[PDB]
Amino acid sequence: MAVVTTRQLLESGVHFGHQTRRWNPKMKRFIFTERNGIYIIDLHQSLTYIDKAYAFVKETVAKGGQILFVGTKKQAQESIVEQATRVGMPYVNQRWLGGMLTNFQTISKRIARLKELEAMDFDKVSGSGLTKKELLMLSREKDKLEKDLGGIRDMPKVPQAVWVVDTKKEHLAIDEARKLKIPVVAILDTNCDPDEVDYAIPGNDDAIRSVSLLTRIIADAAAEGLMARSAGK
RNA sequence: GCUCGUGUCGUGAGAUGUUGGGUUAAGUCCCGCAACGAGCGCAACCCUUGUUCACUGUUGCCAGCACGUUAUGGUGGGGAC
Numbered sequence A: 001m002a003v004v005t006t007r008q009l010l011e012s013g014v015h016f017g018h019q020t021r022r023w024n025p026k027m028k029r030f031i032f033t034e035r036n037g038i039y040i041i042d043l044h045q046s047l048t049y050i051d052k053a054y055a056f057v058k059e060t061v062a063k064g065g066q067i068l069f070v071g072t073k074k075q076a077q078e079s080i081v082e083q084a085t086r087v088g089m090p091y092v093n094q095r096w097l098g099g100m101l102t103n104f105q106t107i108s109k110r111i112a113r114l115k116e117l118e119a120m121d122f123d124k125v126s127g128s129g130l131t132k133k134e135l136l137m138l139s140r141e142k143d144k145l146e147k148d149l150g151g152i153r154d155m156p157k158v159p160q161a162v163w164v165v166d167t168k169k170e171h172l173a174i175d176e177a178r179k180l181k182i183p184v185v186a187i188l189d190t191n192c193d194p195d196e197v198d199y200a201i202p203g204n205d206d207a208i209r210s211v212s213l214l215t216r217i218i219a220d221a222a223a224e225g226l227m228a229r230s231a232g233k
Numbered sequence B: 001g002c003u004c005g006u007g008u009c010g011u012g013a014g015a016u017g018u019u020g021g022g023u024u025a026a027g028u029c030c031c032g033c034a035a036c037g038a039g040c041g042c043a044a045c046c047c048u049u050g051u052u053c054a055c056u057g058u059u060g061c062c063a064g065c066a067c068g069u070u071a072u073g074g075u076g077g078g079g080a081c
Helices: A007-012 A045-062 A074-087 A104-126 A135-148 A171-180 A208-232
Strands: A067-070 A161-164 A184-188 A199-202
Touching (some): A007 A208, A045 A184, A045 A199, A104 A135, A171 A184, A184 A208
Parallel strands (some): A067 A161, A184 A199
């Protein structure tokens, strides 16, 4: 969308990148100016790329829409979850584990187990008595499953697209996504790869708000598409 | 301790899980983790021993009561031990 063009980007500081020490060579075209070691995003083609990502997410929600918001960095832990819960869009925030996208059967088994336990554990703790170190360990297992699984509850089948923040940390997600052929949209700074991302959105990924405004705008896009789905049906 | 399902890595045998840090009598748990799970083992359920309560009182027991061959709770009786 408009997102007041480059004004919001410049005020927030998206133009920041990484220094010369580590760099992905596929960024040769993507160079504005060498300012104080930190690489500078031109932020001009960024508008076009975010517009293209917006168009693709509109098309995905037109065909029905299922975006998996994957995130692990401390700069996005407290940002991804709130917007994903607001839009009602599936998300993972703590320890994206090997599988899920490929271990569909096991993850669905754990989804069913979590669904049944979230009721039976509460019924047992609130009703009939139970001894210690058994109810306690079941509650602890519930807590661990809740910590390691958030918005993954609601998915009937394989998703439609995945939104990635800090692909360097969440590398395995893109490998699974490319193996199973799902659209990928990711935040990439000057050290990431365009070959493994179809709809690439360059920009900083080291600040809390730097990923927060992008996740907020894509959440607004998802909410608008979900509203339009009422007429689309 | 030994393995499996699925995933993943490798052309392949195979690997990962099951490595690492901490802990435990224990692959016992915890933390992190391309692993996510499960199974047989460990543990627990069983028997016995250590404390205690209720119930029952003979062929067991005898605190309070009455005699007993002198004598043996032998006796009527007693639920205390």
